Paper text:
Hepatitis B virus (HBV) core protein (HBc) plays a crucial role in the virus life cycle, making it an important detection marker for HBV infection and a potential target for treatment.
In this study, we determined the high-resolution structure for the interacting region between cAbD4 Fab and HBc dimer. Due to the symmetric identification on both sides of a dimer tip, the ASUs exhibit some heterogeneity, allowing for the application of four binding models: Class 1 (A3B4/C3D4), Class 2 (A4B3/C4D3), Class 3 (A4B3/C3D4), and Class 4 (A3B4/C4D3). Based on this kind of novel and accurate classification of dimer units, we further improved the local resolution around the interface between cAbD4 Fab and HBc dimer, which provided more detailed information of their interactions. In addition, the negatively charged residues E77 in both chains A and B formed salt bridges with the positively charged residues K31 in the heavy chain and H31 in the light chain.
Numbering used by the authors:
A (entry chain A): 3 to 142
B (entry chain l): 1 to 114
C (entry chain h): 1 to 121
D (entry chain B): 2 to 142
């Protein structure tokens, strides 16, 4: 019932991150695949975020299959466009968030992710008049 | 249930000049899908009606670009850039937000006499 | 392009009841709805009723509410409109159409048929 | 290029051989997950990958239900809704039923016996009905 609980994070902690400042889907897909294909392919079972990413990719595959099927049938042309737009735009926010989180911890280390995530909340809260110009990156 | 309205009742156009016709509806047509259910129809003497604009702001297939329209909410307008000799007819606007469906009053066009 | 042809129109003696024929072909009747349009001379179009693909639901306007009924036979893909208690205000040409732009505006309109009531012949 | 069961030593075909009737209803699986494993489901623990799969399946299917409700509300054409809801509920949910049963069973009895039950069921089904023994093998305890 809690998406992330067991990583020392909360759904409310991610609220401070605005929805718009996330990365695009295909970038996260590529970043996971190219870098960590070997990690995906192993007999070792540990760091459950590995399995979590395996569930995320499966869910995305199923949604894409639904999208193509709708593209195939569904006689009204519009309803089709409405459903396609909804699945493309609204449907991917949660998966995108999941991929960002898991890659971030998957890339560097958890403590570095938790630090970045609590610090970034500072940037949005400060006023533009005296806010520092640049925002915090995950770095490494 | 819905009261429909059209204006002006008549409009004679010298052909080759633009013209605009306005149709108004009482209740809002913005559904939760971001779309507006409003129609533009064309009717010719001795012939069946033909479609002009669909879904409020999308042109029906096969319709020439000479006709265009836009608008949202309770206000819409039909605009024709260039009037051709074959454009004479009576135009209608319709509502499809809530059943039962209601039609307008009509708008007939002609050529201004000398 | 789909082509629809009606039949059964003509003159009917006053006080009786008549049934009009509107058949369609070239598209999936089970996947789309149907509508009825009327035009007495001197006025414009007026919506009357419609039926959904299943046929379980239907709607009517207050002018003819409770006196007209519509039904479909998916076996032969033919529309049906039954008229009872006809009046002098019902003399008009009837059109059956189909709408598929997301269930809002009619797309293909049939040729229509006129119905006339009077005592002289 | 993903073998979800490979991390436990099983393959997709093992379950694909299982007919649809065998899996229970979705409500049954959700009720079992709620009643029998809620205490440790939310709590943090190490290893226990099955917990992580169950947790993400519950979110996925909740999102699917939200989609079903949203399409029911809007979607002005009256027919499409039947086809959409049918595909979302009966066809797509099969994989969810597939995964939920696998993992729930794995939690109660562990890999030791479920794999053998699977191989035995496959052996039983493969043969024709004429020489098939009376009844399908039961997992038992």
């Amino acid at each position: 019932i809690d998406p992330y609980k067991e990583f020392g994070a909360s759904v409310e902690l991610l609220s401070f991150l605005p929805s718009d400042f996330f990365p695009s889907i295909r970038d996260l897909l590529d970043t996971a695949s190219a870098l960590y294909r070997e990690a995906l392919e192993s007999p070792e079972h540990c760091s459950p975020h590995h399995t979590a990413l395996r569930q995320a990719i499966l869910c995305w595959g199923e949604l894409m299959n639904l999208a193509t099927w709708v593209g195939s049938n569904l006689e009204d042309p519009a309803s089709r466009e409405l459903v396609v737009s909804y699945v493309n735009v609204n449907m991917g926010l949660k998966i995108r968030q999941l991929l960002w989180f898991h890659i971030s911890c998957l890339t560097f280390g958890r403590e570095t992710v938790l630090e970045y995530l609590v610090s970034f909340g500072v940037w949005i809260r400060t006023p533009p008049a005296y806010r520092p110009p640049n925002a915090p990156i995950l770095s490494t | 249930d819905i009261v429909m309205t059209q204006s002006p009742l008549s409009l004679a156009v010298t052909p080759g000049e633009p013209a605009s016709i306005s149709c108004r509806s009482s209740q809002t047509l913005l559904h939760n899908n971001g779309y507006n259910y409003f129609s533009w129809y064309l009717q010719k003497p001795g012939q069946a009606p033909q479609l002009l604009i669909y879904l409020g702001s999308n042109r029906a297939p096969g319709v020439s670009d000479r006709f265009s329209g836009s608008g949202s909410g309770t206000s819409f307008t039909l605009e024709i850039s260039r009037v051709e000799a074959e454009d004479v007819g009576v135009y209608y606007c319709m509502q499809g937000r809530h059943t039962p469906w209601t039609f307008g009053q009509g708008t007939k066009v002609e050529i201004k006499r000398t | 392009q789909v082509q629809l042809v009606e039949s059964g129109g003509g003159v009917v003696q006053p006080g009786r009841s008549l049934r009009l024929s509107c058949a369609a072909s070239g598209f999936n009747f089970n996947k789309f709805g149907m509508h009825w349009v009327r035009q007495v001379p001197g006025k414009g179009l007026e919506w009357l009723t419609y039926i959904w693909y299943d046929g379980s639901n239907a709607d009517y306007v207050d002018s003819v509410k409770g006196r007209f009924t519509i039904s479909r036979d998916n076996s032969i893909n033919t529309l049906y409109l039954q008229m009872n208690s006809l009046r002098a205000d019902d003399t008009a040409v009837y059109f059956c159409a189909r709408g598929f732009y997301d269930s809002s505006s009619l797309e293909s309109w049939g040729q229509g048929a006129l119905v006339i009531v009077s005592s002289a012949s």
